[PDB]
Design a protein around this ligand. Structure first.
Ligand SMILES: [K+]
Ligand SMILES: [K+]
Ligand SMILES: [K+]
Ligand SMILES: [K+]
Lengths: 447, 452
């Protein structure tokens, strides 16, 4: 099959040793930099057609992070790839002890549709830097980006090492029968289980970046003007379609109306009176998802928004009040521009609420009280945490990005990408000279 | 059922919060120290009954490593558990950025039979140190150790947090239907696939310490006296039943006879002329494995040994020459005292031989040439590597132990155990005050574009 042949060619190119010199890896990273610069308008056009992004947010909410990762990895690669001496003991003073990093082989990256350039290419950057071949499977839901990447990746990168596999679910299923040395998947919790099951057939390690509902606790006595503008930015970027969007708010009933008012103020600042006319507001990816999200508004009290246009997949920025946690909007990841507010009567109740649910990819809290922030962190579990902001924690080189429990396993970004896509091999090198200190270990044992 | 109740109790005890304070964790680790001290003779008796170990090798080839791990983890725990600040950026210089470590919840450790104390309790030590409840499933093949641990663990450790599950494969299968937050398994490559498949049902992360045939390349130019003594020791300890035993030798035909002679010399020093009379030589774990290993001698050119006694499950230290790489002894992990020598014409042929096979848990090479060592490491892949010795690389606090490919995924020992059994949670904590620098990110976007 075309899929088997592409994987075979990637594996043969890897086994040849081509990717082992750092110079080769850096040439391919530099070719990706050239791709991003030269294909800027094409990338914008694809993101506009798939998701109703514009030239500014295509770059500053997505493509820029890929460029930043490439530049940082090129700079750090020689230090990261070096053998790393480790601590000795009195018995091993004359030995060399070190961790050797080496590629895994052929890595598969399965992209997702909501940031279809970042979530295909940013993982690829780390896997290239670690010396692997990298097979890419873009999501078919972001059809324009998928088509674009199939054309431009082989225009810039080695054609055997870094192939792009076209198609949808059947092609991904077929691809998952192939033998890889690591799989990174971004997507749903349910498909994560399918990926891990396929990986098990070849003992392939996985990095799974999955889902959940990221809570956003807002403390009673905090600056709501600052808080709600930050929350609205993260919730409504990309029309709500972000893995670490603040999915829902938990707050004391006494500040619910203040939160609604300040979110509304920020939304009008951001997108005007009619967000359908804002160049900065996105659209839902597909008709299925449009219908799903609109269904989540049914039965709810709409404090703002609540309307949609099926033909162009516009959903107005929507705020829901006094939401029943058992209702549908509170029983699935929303992934759209619908923000429910759930009342809780204390920090302790908020912590209980979060812990009774599955572990989220992100947890957010807004408070001016350092003790509240430390307590909530200490008593909950999530992939990552931001206090007093949203989104930003997954964009930083020094903070590995990943989930826990149902939100995933493993992590990447920065140095952690290099580690994730390598094998870290413990090495002990001893002199081949008689050593009296060793003879105690040989039989016969002493009486 | 019994299994479901033990896991339910462990999860409830974890949710109570009792494991979170470091004081509690250190108490449980100190209780394991006390168990090792007070149950010294019982542990030896169980290893003697299971594997024909004695009081010396029970301790110095197994129990001592658990003790050292406990002592090391107790002293380091507060540093390892602390929030870890990380590098800031100009845009985050006024924030706090750090990695917060927290327990996973309920960890399952599935032990194996060949080092039935170490490969149950050393992983448990790490999981306890990281604040988890830990369910233990000992292997039924080391029956005396399995029964002993079911008795003594609850005498020393918290009863609800740290239960021991009895039984064989049917009970392990039932246990794998329960929801855990991490599973560590030591055993075969084949069962590792079954474990990972069961883990996928709950998105449970796994550490799999699996199998393979660890090659041992001996350079033509090296000191064969020193090399063969070290090889013999690692190969024949525990009657060959070690996950990182040097499984087979690769060497130039010109040195095969000298290797045989020096292996024989060391074997005679270790165990006498008749190894069956040595208190230091072990026995095969079970009748099934006795028949399997004996089968691997059939059809082979025997240089030394080659016989066994089914009644005691003794297999003589055995060396095979001019071994066909396609023959049974070279097509499965031996896990017994049968050492095949396979001939290669060069280092390059040895590298190719190793690379055509699945990635082994350990790779060994004996050479006084630095370039040979560096080239073999650079051109192969294995879980870990030792040059000029065997076994020892997996006993050091500073060298994580684990496989790659078919020999496994993940690692543990020392700080790596604490990390493996924790979630490392990235945290950004910003002041809640207006910050003008943030406003660039908010829509509306600039209507005119500028250079990037
Ligand atoms: K309501
Ligand atoms: K001795
Ligand atoms: K620490
Ligand atoms: K602005």
């Amino acid at each position: 099959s075309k899929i088997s042949e592409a994987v075979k060619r990637a594996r043969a190119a890897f086994s040849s040793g081509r990717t082992r010199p750092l110079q080769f890896r850096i040439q391919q990273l530099e070719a990706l930099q050239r791709l991003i610069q030269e294909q800027e308008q094409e990338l914008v056009g694809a993101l506009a057609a798939d998701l109703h992004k514009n030239e500014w947010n295509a770059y500053y909410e997505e493509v820029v992070y890929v460029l930043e990762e490439i530049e940082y990895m090129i700079q750090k690669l020689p230090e990261w790839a070096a053998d790393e001496p480790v601590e000795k003991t009195p018995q091993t003073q004359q030995d060399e002890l070190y961790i050797h990093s080496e590629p895994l082989g052929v890595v598969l990256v399965i992209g997702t549709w909501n940031y279809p350039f970042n979530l295909t290419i940013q993982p690829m950057v780390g896997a290239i830097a670690a010396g692997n071949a990298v097979v890419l499977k873009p999501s078919e839901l972001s059809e324009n980006m998928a088509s674009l990447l199939a054309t431009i990746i082989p225009q810039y990168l080695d054609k055997d090492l870094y192939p792009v596999i076209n198609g949808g679910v059947p092609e991904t299923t077929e691809l998952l029968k192939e033998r890889f040395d690591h799989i990174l998947y971004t997507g749903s919790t349910g498909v994560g289980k399918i990926i891990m099951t396929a990986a098990a057939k070849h003992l392939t390690p996985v990095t799974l970046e999955l889902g959940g509902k990221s809570p956003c606790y807002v403390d009673k006595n905090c600056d709501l003007d600052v808080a709600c503008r930050r929350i609205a930015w993260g919730k409504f970027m990309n029309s709500g379609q972000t893995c670490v969007a603040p999915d829902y708010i938990l707050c004391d009933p006494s500040i619910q109306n203040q939160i609604v008012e300040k979110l509304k103020k920020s939304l009008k600042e951001f997108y005007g009176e009619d967000a359908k006319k804002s160049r900065d507001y996105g659209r839902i990816i597909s008709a299925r998802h449009f219908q799903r999200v609109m269904g989540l508004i049914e039965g709810q009290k709409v404090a703002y928004g609540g309307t949609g246009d099926a033909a162009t997949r516009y959903i107005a920025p929507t705020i829901l009040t006094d939401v029943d946690p058992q209702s549908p909007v509170m029983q699935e990841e929303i992934f759209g521009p619908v923000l429910p507010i759930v009342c809780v009567r204390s920090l302790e109740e908020a912590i209980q609420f979060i812990n009774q649910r599955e572990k989220p990819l992100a947890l957010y809290m807004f408070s001016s009280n350092d003790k509240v922030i430390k307590k909530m962190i200490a008593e909950t579990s999530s992939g990552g945490v931001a206090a007093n902001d949203v989104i930003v924690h997954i964009t930083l080189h020094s903070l590995p990005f990943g989930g826990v429990g149902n939100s995933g396993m493993g992590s990447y970004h920065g140095k952690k990408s290099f580690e994730t896509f390598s094998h870290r091999r413990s090495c002990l090198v001893r002199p081949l000279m008689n050593d009296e200190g060793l003879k105690v270990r040989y039989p016969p044992s002493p009486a």
